[PDB]
């Protein structure tokens, strides 16, 4: 299965910057969401979940086809709550109806990371909507009540190695868990992208508790939480080393997250040798907007 990137006809960097800016301005405007977290974190999670269906073995799933728009995938229990991100993006899509769905969902995550003061994430256009029959079945996204060996095996399907896994999970500095979505509750409610995930893992005093859904999670007295799969990153000695690295080097974390997150968003896509180079969007702040 080959998915060849095809640039939306006649579009260039300055078209996609406009879309980025519309997303970014709406992120600033719609600030009340989720007790004043705003939509940044949910957009990052949307971009990940639309990408994380990918299977390297047969090139099924992935961001290219925009298949989250279809009910089988929209309704995946693993995607509960992401409808809020889709609803955020609907006026953006109405303004810019020429962008493909996969391009919009992936660009929403890039825009969110950058506007939350995270790294620059180079981004490539040309995902093409594919039909409803190409929608992957539910069950391809990961469970949270598992251990490091589970996490490591899971991510091999996505062609991610230990460093890439640990870097990607730093996104768990953002937003929160919600009991009614996933059966986990709590988190920093943070809407600034930092390396805090790693510092919290190493620094807090964690206790293994049960939540009101009868699931185990790690809680800190400071009011933070970790999923079992997050905590596994300090139980496994290989992950632990990388957690320490990122807890001690903000810039390295930023660079490695950027590389892994673009990768994630590009898995499954064949870019022609003459395709445009990746775009690096300016933030609103860099534009004086």
Q: Give contact residues for ligand 26D (rule: CB under 6 A).
A: 172, 174-177, 187-188, 225-227, 230
Looking only at the bridges linking them, the beta strands covering 225-226 and 216-220 are: antiparallel
Residue 144 or 247: the one with the smaller Cβ distance to ligand HEM is 144
**Residue 278 CA: distances (Å) to CA of 19, 67, 126:** 15, 23, 11
Contact of 207 with 219, CB cutoff 8 Å: yes
Closest CB to ligand HEM among residues 171, 284 = 171
Is 182 within any annotated ligand binding site? yes
Under the phi-then-psi rule, with left for phi > 0, alpha for psi from -120 to 50, and beta for the rest, what region is 16? alpha
Q: Are 268 and 62 in contact (CB under 8 A)?
A: yes
Name the binder of 182 from ligand HEM, ligand 26D, none, CB < 5-8 A by kind.
ligand HEM
Judged by CB under 6 A, does residue 234 bind ligand HEM?
no
What is the smallest separation between the CB atom of 288 and ligand 26D, expressed in angstroms? 31
The verdict on whether residue 176 carries a ligand-binding annotation is yes
Dist. CA 244–CA 142, nearest whole Å: 24
Q: Is 45 annotated as a binding residue?
A: yes
Of 5, 107, 166, 168, the one binding ligand HEM by CB under 6 A: 168
Question: Residue 57 annotated as binding?
Answer: no
Q: Is 48 annotated as a binding residue?
A: yes
Residue 77 or 91: the one with the smaller Cβ distance to ligand HEM is: 77
Q: What is the DSSP letter of 19?
A: H
Residues 166, 171, 233, 247: which binds ligand HEM (CB under 6 A)? 171
176 binds ligand HEM (CB under 6 A): yes
The closest of 191, 172, 166, 190 to 253, measured between CA atoms, is: 166
Query: What tokens does 22 get?
Result: 């519309």
Binding-site string for ligand HEM from residue 78 to residue 97, where x marks contact by CB under 6 A and - marks none: ---x----------------
Q: Is 117 left (phi over 0), alpha (psi -120 to 50) or beta?
A: left
CB closer to ligand 26D, 49 vs 176: 176
Interface pick for ligand HEM out of 122, 142, 186, 276 (rule CB under 6 A):
142
174 is a contact residue toward ligand HEM (CB under 6 A): yes
Backbone angles phi, psi at 273, to 5 degrees: -65, -25
The first and second tokens of residue 48, run together, are 């990940």
Residue 228, both tokens:
């079992």
Contact 22, 95 (CB under 8 A): yes
From ligand 26D, ligand HEM, none, which one binds at residue 142 (CB under 5 to 8 Å depending on kind)? Answer: ligand HEM
Q: Which is nearer to ligand HEM, 66 or 170 (CB)?
A: 170
Binding-site residues, please? 45, 48, 172, 176, 178, 181-182
């Amino acid at each position: 299965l080959v998915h060849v990137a095809s640039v939306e006809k006649g579009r260039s960097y300055e078209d996609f910057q406009k879309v980025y800016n519309a997303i970014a301005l709406k992120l600033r405007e719609d600030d009340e969401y989720d007790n004043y977290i705003g939509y940044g974190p949910v957009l990052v999670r949307l971009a990940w979940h639309i990408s994380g269906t990918w299977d390297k073995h047969d090139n099924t799933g992935g961001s290219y086809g925009g298949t989250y728009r279809f009910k089988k995938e929209f309704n995946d229990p693993s995607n509960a709550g992401l409808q809020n991100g889709f609803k955020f993006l609907e006026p953006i899509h109405k303004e810019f109806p020429w962008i493909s769905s996969g391009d919009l969902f992936s660009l929403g995550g890039v825009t969110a990371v950058q506007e939350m003061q995270g790294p620059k994430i180079p981004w490539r256009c040309g995902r093409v909507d594919t039909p409803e029959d190409t929608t992957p079945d539910n069950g391809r996204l990961p469970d949270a009540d598992k251990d490091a060996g589970y996490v490591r095996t899971f991510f091999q399907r996505l062609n991610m190695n230990d460093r890439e896994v640990v870097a990607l999970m730093g996104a768990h500095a953002l937003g929160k868990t919600h009991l009614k979505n996933s059966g986990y509750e709590g988190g920093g409610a943070n809407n600034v992208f930092t390396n805090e995930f790693y510092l919290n893992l190493l620094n807090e005093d964690w206790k293994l508790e049960k939540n009101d859904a009868n699931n185990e999670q790690w809680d800190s007295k400071s009011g933070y939480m970790m999923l079992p799969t997050d905590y596994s990153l300090i139980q496994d000695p290989k992950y632990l080393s990388i957690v320490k690295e990122y807890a001690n080097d903000q810039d390295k974390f930023f660079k490695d997250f950027s590389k892994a997150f673009e990768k994630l968003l590009e898995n499954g896509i064949t870019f022609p040798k003459d395709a445009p180079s990746p775009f690096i969007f300016k933030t609103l702040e860099e534009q004086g907007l």
